[PDB]
Symmetry: D2
Subunit: 469 residues, 4 copies
Amino acid sequence: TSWSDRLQNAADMPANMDKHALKKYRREAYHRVFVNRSLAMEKIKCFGFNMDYTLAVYKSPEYESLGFELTVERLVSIGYPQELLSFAYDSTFPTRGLVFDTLYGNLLKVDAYGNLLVCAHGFNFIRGPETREQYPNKFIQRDDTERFYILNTLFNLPETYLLACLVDFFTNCPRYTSCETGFKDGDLFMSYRSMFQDVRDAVDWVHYKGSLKEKTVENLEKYVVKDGKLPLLLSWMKEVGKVFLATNSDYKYTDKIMTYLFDFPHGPKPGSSHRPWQSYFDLILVDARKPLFFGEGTVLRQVDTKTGKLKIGTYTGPLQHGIVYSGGSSDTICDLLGAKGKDILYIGDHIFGDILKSKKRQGWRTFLVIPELAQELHVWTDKSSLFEELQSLDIFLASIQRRIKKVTHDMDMCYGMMGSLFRSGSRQTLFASQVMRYADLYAASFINLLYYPFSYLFRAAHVLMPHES
Amino acid sequence: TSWSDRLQNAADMPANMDKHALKKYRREAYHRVFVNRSLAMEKIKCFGFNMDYTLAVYKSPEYESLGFELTVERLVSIGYPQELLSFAYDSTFPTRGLVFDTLYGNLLKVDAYGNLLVCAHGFNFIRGPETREQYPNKFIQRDDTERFYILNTLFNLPETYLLACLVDFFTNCPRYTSCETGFKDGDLFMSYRSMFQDVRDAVDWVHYKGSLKEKTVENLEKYVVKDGKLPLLLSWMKEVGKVFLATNSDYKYTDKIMTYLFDFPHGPKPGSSHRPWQSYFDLILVDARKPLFFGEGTVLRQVDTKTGKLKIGTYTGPLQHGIVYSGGSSDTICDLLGAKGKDILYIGDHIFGDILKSKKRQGWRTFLVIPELAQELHVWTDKSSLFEELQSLDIFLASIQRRIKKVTHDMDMCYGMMGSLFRSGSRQTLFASQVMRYADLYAASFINLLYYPFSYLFRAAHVLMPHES
Amino acid sequence: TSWSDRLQNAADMPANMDKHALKKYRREAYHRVFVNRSLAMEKIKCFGFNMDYTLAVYKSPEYESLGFELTVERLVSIGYPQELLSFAYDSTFPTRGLVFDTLYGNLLKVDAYGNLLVCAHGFNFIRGPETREQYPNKFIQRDDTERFYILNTLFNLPETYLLACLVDFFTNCPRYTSCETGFKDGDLFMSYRSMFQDVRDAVDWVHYKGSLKEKTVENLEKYVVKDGKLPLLLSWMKEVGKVFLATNSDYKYTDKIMTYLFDFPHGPKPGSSHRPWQSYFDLILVDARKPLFFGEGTVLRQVDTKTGKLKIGTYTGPLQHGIVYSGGSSDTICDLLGAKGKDILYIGDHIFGDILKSKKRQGWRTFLVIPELAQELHVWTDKSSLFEELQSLDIFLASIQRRIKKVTHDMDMCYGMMGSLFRSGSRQTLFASQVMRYADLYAASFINLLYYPFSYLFRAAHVLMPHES
Amino acid sequence: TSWSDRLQNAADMPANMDKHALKKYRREAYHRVFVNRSLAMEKIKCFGFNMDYTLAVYKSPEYESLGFELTVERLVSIGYPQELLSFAYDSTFPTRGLVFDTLYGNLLKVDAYGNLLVCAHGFNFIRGPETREQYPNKFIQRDDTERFYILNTLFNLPETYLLACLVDFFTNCPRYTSCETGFKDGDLFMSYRSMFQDVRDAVDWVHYKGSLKEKTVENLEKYVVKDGKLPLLLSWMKEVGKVFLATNSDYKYTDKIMTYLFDFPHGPKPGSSHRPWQSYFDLILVDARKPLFFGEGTVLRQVDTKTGKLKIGTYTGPLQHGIVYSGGSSDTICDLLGAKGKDILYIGDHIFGDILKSKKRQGWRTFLVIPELAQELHVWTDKSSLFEELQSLDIFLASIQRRIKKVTHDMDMCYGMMGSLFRSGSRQTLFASQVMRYADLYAASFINLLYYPFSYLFRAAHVLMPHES
Ligand SMILES: Nc1ncnc2c1ncn2[C@H]1C[C@H](O)[C@@H](COP(=O)(O)OP(=O)(O)OP(=O)(O)O)O1
Ligand SMILES: Nc1ncnc2c1ncn2[C@H]1C[C@H](O)[C@@H](COP(=O)(O)OP(=O)(O)OP(=O)(O)O)O1
Ligand SMILES: Nc1ncnc2c1ncn2[C@H]1C[C@H](O)[C@@H](COP(=O)(O)OP(=O)(O)OP(=O)(O)O)O1
Ligand SMILES: Nc1ncnc2c1ncn2[C@H]1C[C@H](O)[C@@H](COP(=O)(O)OP(=O)(O)OP(=O)(O)O)O1
Ligand SMILES: [Mg+2]
Ligand SMILES: [Mg+2]
Ligand SMILES: [Mg+2]
Ligand SMILES: [Mg+2]
């Protein structure tokens, strides 16, 4: 059972819109909205969305596997060895939010301070003492952004696994000589950095120039979660406020995906007339180029929705019914909707490009969707005794240290080879820390908002400093 | 009673070095070390210091007043109006960590997210609705570092008050016409930004080219806290590890100040021979240029300690007894002391330049001295009922809002016109948030380490995400 | 008769290799090598080439017309109006080296100092007094490189004409409202700058992603000058020194073009065995990325000449027979050929990217090919009386001014609507000035070197300052 | 006899203002204005000046010697060795326009292309073959501005000599070990680059913080050329156009110097009332910060001429009688005087900061003063036979090469150890080339304009390309 299996299972339920029944779905932690900072929902006037991995949740591991296969085929097409074709995507290896160290070719799981939690070179998990040769202080400078690449999104899962596959392959293939910073192949030297860049370029290529979008849209039922509650929730949002879409995807792809997401023989509720997807939005904006969108952005363009091409020129006109925008900036949204940042709840899956940047640059309210949480919560509750044991081992304070390392490993392995998205044993990950700091609300799915009234006061406890406690 | 009065009062006590007595001083919160992240003191191998406002705590309000007077005199000398000479420093106005908005000429107290807590234009405190004209989302982009200047250090207290004095003066002087972004004086326009830059330049000038250092060293007893426990604590540190100084001040000034700090008729304890200050340090480094120090730094130079001039050339030799360094980088410290970052506890008063930068760039352990905490703790305990009332007003949830604003104001005024360093009512300041995030330990004075054994395990509770709780 | 007709006519002659006959071809200025700075040919140890418009001279106006047609079709495909399809390339309009002013949408012919010689808005030639509104000092800041784009190469001829066609079209089409900096189309505004960028992008697109290369290679006889003397001259160069190719084109295209250039039923001379083109070069380097090539360059790669793909990795091996390089830098050439800059004669057609940059950055000796010179010389000699009259009108110095403007116009029109590449009347162009300053030698074709012995001393008179004369 | 002796000798002559007598002074090349590009003086509407080394020509070698002595004393004061105090300025060593190579510690005389003409390491003149170790192509990349510093101005003469003195001293002092890129002094390494920066900093220091200005103004007759024809010429300029001053010097110094330059017991002519210097200018601007002045400049300020301090604020008012400006940009001049660039003749001594930048950035007309030309012309005519012999040796073309090197050396030595400002033998210097390219007119002194009517047409021959000749 993958995280998307859980989400599609919950998607197959029709909404019992009885108020006591609505409250009741929160009986499961799976259906809750979690709160880092208090948020009075009655103050939200605009609900903003992105599409990819938020409205359109790609099915796992099928979609990752497709991305992986196509990225591999692109690398082979540009001259990587044929052996790459024998790789096959393994969903048990990657966890999201890992850092690829381009100097030494390691995948690292780090905390908020850049401290090393896990280090894998290919499929070799390097124990603490061995990591000290390359990381003398068990630490990386996180924002040495030329050296370290943070794999933030679900789109990065295939390349997370591929990077490890490639390092493993080249290390164990006798044609190549392993060196500190890459591989020697006679009179050719392939640095981990150049290899990484080839992988990044190939992933971008499959999405923008290759066949990934075409193959997705060919079999939407295989690749995209569909939920009749999505149009319902969106209709309720539009009754109390304004609704907008700001997607990094282009119009033609957005139209195909959104059409599928709304393709039911009814509108918001069974028995109601079907309405086009565009009717659910007061403002539709594509080619957003987030995170740049939240700064200077790009010139505002208008999409010709008949051809899917941009009209020539900068668009200087007003918000009109049926207009679709391209580019622009977050100020375009605020201006056209008559909103200030704190009147906006932006629902994002990109912790950096949606959530951190909208919060920090614009003071928007934020809702982070974390699709894996569905499965992570299951593991978290199912294996509660392991964490509980770890806590009491940490408490017990006058060997033992090695029992802590044992229990940490067993707990971590329940999630996969790279552990929980949120922690390694008792240490929180960078990702966890960024969720807490920048996501006002978070959940497995934004659909969970269906189970709360729009007057709800989401509450978090006031924080006190140690000297105040 | 100022914060420095408290510190000098505690300084006048001789250390009763009986172990039960040592533990007992922590009876007062005043003498405690506060813990944001756990720290096992037995793992610390190097204790690092800065001088200004850490080892050499300048007396308040005398030192701020001197800086203020000299900065005013410098502005008048370059052609500011004579009326500036009638200003007089008022310690009740400034709180540290405020942000000067150079566009609109406001002092702002903000939270970690850039949300406005307090806004004063001159001495006019602008209420929430009036702030919306200039700050439509009650928010600033914090790291628009060209527009906003964060007044982080105790050295910035005089200019915090002076900026408000200047805005008040020009606003109410009929020769000047108030405009949105500054003042018109016939055919001359003085922007708030150019005014701010003149103030910054004048403060730097008094410290580096003017008479402030000369006047300080003329009357050290008036201007600098002196404590016989300082040599004692430093001697205990050097028995268990290495001790270093990395100061942004120059050698001649450092030597004068440090000589005074160690001028007792004994060494570490009464009855022991006096030893020179330099003997307490394994490494002494001046002209550090923090925060650049924690990145590329500057070329390593050697001080000629007889003349106080730098020797000509880059210093390429080893660590030897009696050598004094200038410039260099944090790597100089690590290399020469045989340390990794996590073996170092750096004791700083500059939340950005000492603590945030050493933590983020190098993974050093951090101890933040907050001289005002002595007085803030007194107010915090003395007026506990006001905060308690605020908490219960916030709790009480089905008018009232205006009672919250009332009680918030009364609480805040107990600290001064700009409120507590750490909060406005129930909202934490940027400064508070940065202390929690980057200072592993903090206290009113690093001398509080005297009351803990060097095997002590400083403990903070493990943090859990909302879905984990 | 186009310039390429002259070059192909001279190309059809077999070389009479008798020494008196060889000297005799210089009887015509058409066959001479012109000298800006003295150059002793015996000191040249390496002869370097580029391919496009040097070895492979594209036929005119057929090749420009093809580029124009394909660029137009690309613009229409992205949504420019259908009327673009009625444009047809006119070789009589563009002269090379014009500057497009992206602010005001003008093509400008300028001197070395940025003084305006000609200004055309669309097909409207703006007289001197009217230019003062937009150019108050009849001057542009040349190296405001964001505003002004210099159309240096023969590849830029189609876009030179297209820019004028577009400005003319939009100006005279009633759907658009002409504004100072572009065109208004209802709620869309198309700046001259955005229009220019679309044109630049479309020209790059047709060359790198579209069908231009495919259509060229489909009909090489229509599009490329072929000359049996090319292999002869190259063989003579390789007898006295080393020969290299450094082209911005890729290997697959280079191989197709070079194969055609060498496709005769003999080698260097009639009766000799045919040899592959690669055998004429000691070093072959593609994807050069000039002008960056003459600075840091890019990593050195090796071409797999069987597949035409790059091998994976940086190439660290030596110069070997049959190796083909990609990327690298000018230092790659020097190192592998054992050359210093002044031992190298680089034969280029790009005044900036080949000639100015190799001279200024590396002190290479330079030979500039100027394909138009064949036709320009014909006009220059044929209409000598007009220039002579202008000179004597300028001399005659005590009306007249307007006769000078008349004769200047008649002279200029003999070359085309934008005049001579080298002048407008008595004023030299930027291009002329850059040829004189950076091209040690220049000619209509590098084949003209066939008519000089390799011991020849090319001589230019020593320059004296006015006070030295 | 120094160049300033010639200028002061000509300064002592009263102007015989008879028209035939005025023309007659041009009998001597010393009194001519030389022409690189034609200039119709009737079109000049504004005459612009700088002060230092143009209006105020500092006497040689006294002024250079003073700068040298004070710079040496500053270096010794910061800790350079006492032996520096035994250096004494030698006017026979430096020529202006040399390039200091900070990597290898050489003074280089180069041509326009960066080719090496002379290379001296200390006082050791390195012959051609020995230069190849450090300069393999006998070439430098001129605009590697971090490595190479061009000593353009007469203010740079002392440091030109001092750099050679320092390299010579450290090389021959047994305490120091000579290395490729500087000197080792035990555990201190002094790079040529750090040494150079210390020298540059010390020269700036003596001018802006030290005693050079004070010592100059103490003995103006010793240090500054004074000429009764200066007020006469300026008065004639103001009768036909506008006159402005744009100086990099501050107001207080400008006022002292200009007062001295105008201190005669008469105004423009004997018998006329004396007028203050300021009355000769329609616009006076100090603190110009050329060359930045010709780009964005700095904010426009107003000088309080009573105190010599700047008024607080940006000056937004109009041009009024008696106003003195500070900062601003070249656009300030154009706007306030109602001028376009080609209506302005700017009279400068800084080939880069006055002449190249005003020409290239603004299309101003340019007049370069070259104080040394007075003496260079004397040598040029006196030793004409040596150059003539060189020309005929170069002509004679079928040993000899070594006779050319001999005669080149003898010619060069007539000017000093670093040869003529304008050439080494038959090769022109960078400086000569920049004079020709950017200075429309040039002369030993701008006073030479007194000998030409303001309707004069300065004529230069039209330039032809080799193929046009
Ligand atoms: N999740 C992320 N993905 C990619 N880049 C990131 C991420 N978080 C931070 N960065 C980049 C942006 C900055 O250049 C740099 C500094 O990060 P750092 O200040 O340590 O993190 P933070 O949580 O305080 O957020 P921010 O970077 O916005 O300040 O790292
Ligand atoms: N206390 C401070 N004083 C001065 N500048 C600061 C301070 N804190 C942060 N900055 C600067 C450095 C960065 O350019 C910018 C970004 O800040 P931000 O990321 O919002 O804060 P932070 O607490 O995450 O620390 P950091 O800036 O190191 O990432 O602000
Ligand atoms: N022919 C050209 N094409 C494109 N850019 C040019 C050309 N010539 C010069 N430039 C660019 C490079 C510089 O950024 C800028 C400065 O030019 P400028 O100094 O006036 O010309 P130049 O003939 O002295 O050559 P250079 O630019 O190399 O110094 O213009
Ligand atoms: N006389 C000079 N003094 C100092 N810097 C100079 C001088 N001449 C040119 N430069 C600088 C400015 C540029 O960064 C760089 C490029 O010079 P280069 O293009 O070779 O000379 P140039 O005679 O064409 O003038 P320009 O530099 O203005 O283009 O050198
Ligand atoms: Mg998304
Ligand atoms: Mg300090
Ligand atoms: Mg070419
Ligand atoms: Mg000057």
